[PDB]
Amino acid sequence: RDNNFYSVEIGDSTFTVLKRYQNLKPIGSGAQGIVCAAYDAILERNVAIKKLSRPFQNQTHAKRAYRELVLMKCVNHKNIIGLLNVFTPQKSLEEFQDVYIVMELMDANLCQVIQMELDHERMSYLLYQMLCGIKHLHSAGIIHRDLKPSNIVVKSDCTLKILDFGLARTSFMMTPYVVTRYYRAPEVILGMGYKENVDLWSVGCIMGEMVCHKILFPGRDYIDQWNKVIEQLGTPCPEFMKKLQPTVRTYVENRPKYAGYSFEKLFPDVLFPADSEHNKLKASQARDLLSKMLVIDASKRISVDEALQHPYINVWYDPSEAEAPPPKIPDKQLDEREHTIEEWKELIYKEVMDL
Ligand SMILES: O=C(Nc1ccc2n[nH]c(-c3ccncc3)c2c1)[C@@H]1CCN(CC(=O)N2CCN(c3ccc(-c4ncccn4)cc3)CC2)C1
Numbered sequence: 481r482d483n484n485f486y487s488v489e490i491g492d493s494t495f496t497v498l499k500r501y502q503n504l505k506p507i508g509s510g511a512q513g514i515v516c517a518a519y520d521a522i523l524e525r526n527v528a529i530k531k532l533s534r535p536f537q538n539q540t541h542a543k544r545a546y547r548e549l550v551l552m553k554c555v556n557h558k559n560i561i562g563l564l565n566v567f568t569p570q571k572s573l574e575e576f577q578d579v580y581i582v583m584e585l586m587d588a589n590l591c592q593v594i595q596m597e598l599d600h601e602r603m604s605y606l607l608y609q610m611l612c613g614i615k616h617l618h619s620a621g622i623i624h625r626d627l628k629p630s631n632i633v634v635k636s637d638c639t640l641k642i643l644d645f646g647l648a649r650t651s652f653m654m655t656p657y658v659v660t661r662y663y664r665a666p667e668v669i670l671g672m673g674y675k676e677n678v679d680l681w682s683v684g685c686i687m688g689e690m691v692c693h694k695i696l697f698p699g700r701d702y703i704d705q706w707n708k709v710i711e712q713l714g715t716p717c718p719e720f721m722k723k724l725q726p727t728v729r730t731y732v733e734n735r736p737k738y739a740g741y742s743f744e745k746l747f748p749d750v751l752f753p754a755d756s757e758h759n760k761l762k763a764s765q766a767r768d769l770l771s772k773m774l775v776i777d778a779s780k781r782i783s784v785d786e787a788l789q790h791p792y793i794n795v796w797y798d799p800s801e802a803e804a805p806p807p808k809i810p811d812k813q814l815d816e817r818e819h820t821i822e823e824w825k826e827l828i829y830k831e832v833m834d835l
């Protein structure tokens with residue numbers, strides 16, 4: 481029971497885990513906690529274990545932990561990281577501190593894949609899977625808004641899973657950890673409203689980085705971010721500027737003007753396989769897809785369904801993946817809850833125990 485746990489030091493943290501999980505080794509860490517690889521001696525396979533330390537300690541951590549528990553439980557899709565187990569070593573609501581989330585173990589992070597040249601077959605398949613995951617979230621009313629390579633993982637067989645569920649409908653932390661903002665859409669950067677295709681901008685940024693092996697828009701803050709976007713893509717049209725509130729419009733209209741670059745110049749043939757006629761045609765199609773994702777004005781940007789149907793992508797199309805029954809989310813206030821620390825503590829404990 482309590483004797484069915486053991487503890488090991490993992491860097492500056494203590495992991496206290498069920499004895500079924502053996503041979504822990506750190507594989508990543510972030511604002512939310514440390515993740516280890518482990519061998520599950522019962523399943524006879526390796527797994528990933530994330531430790532959430534006092535996730536109820538503030539509202540930002542708490543909302544994310546609670547929503548991720550609920551979503552991981554109700555979602556079952558091959559391109560979304562799946563839940564294998566959840567436990568706490570503490571034996572009561574009173575003593576509760578930590579949550580451990582056990583997931584499928586993948587082979588690499590997409591940041592490592594970005595450092596490799598990819599053939600069109602692998603590149604298109606990875607993008608196809610991203611799009612299936614995103615569409616599946618959208619089908620349940622979940623718009624991610626913060627898709628990024630660090631939170632996407634892959635196997636050697638080119639299978640891909642998204643690790644997180646995004647920004648909900650909402651962030652200050654005392655932390656040395658820094659939020660990666662490079663993939664966020666113009667309507668996020670400028671504080672505009674958004675719709676489902678906010679996520680397609682991020683897919684564009686990821687695709688473009690897979691192709692050129694550089695972060696497209698590495699801004700140090702949102703002002704820098706916007707400059708980098710307009711330097712490459714060009715100052716947006718007046719029809720876009722008109723959609724901005726005056727405080728933001730005066731700012732956007734008063735930046736120096738940029739012509740931008742064609743997509744042929746941003747993503748030349750030398751960045752793609754382009755020897756054979758097959759590869760030439762695929763390079764053309766890839767560039768066309770990029771040109772439809774990396775569109776500042778969201779009203780003119782590709783949708784998930786148009787991307788799934790695009791010639792570069794549609795060779796993979798399978799409605800069991802792309803038209804799967806939507807997740808059924810049981811907490812109808814999932815994105816709107818406001819709670820005290822003590823309230824979030826009880827809500828999370830109950831999720832963990834199933835209570
Ligand atoms: O890692 C996290 N969560 C999970 C969860 C379940 C998992 N299942 N399987 C894996 C897995 C990951 C990596 N390798 C094998 C398996 C999981 C990871 C958390 C989520 C947030 N986080 C990732 C993160 O933000 N990172 C920063 C970027 N980083 C990174 C950056 C550059 C390179 C790199 N590699 C080669 C060349 C150049 N750069 C590699 C990793 C990866 C960790 C920690």
Ligand SMILES: [Mg+2]
Nearest residue numbers: 509510630631
């Ligand atoms: Mg991360």
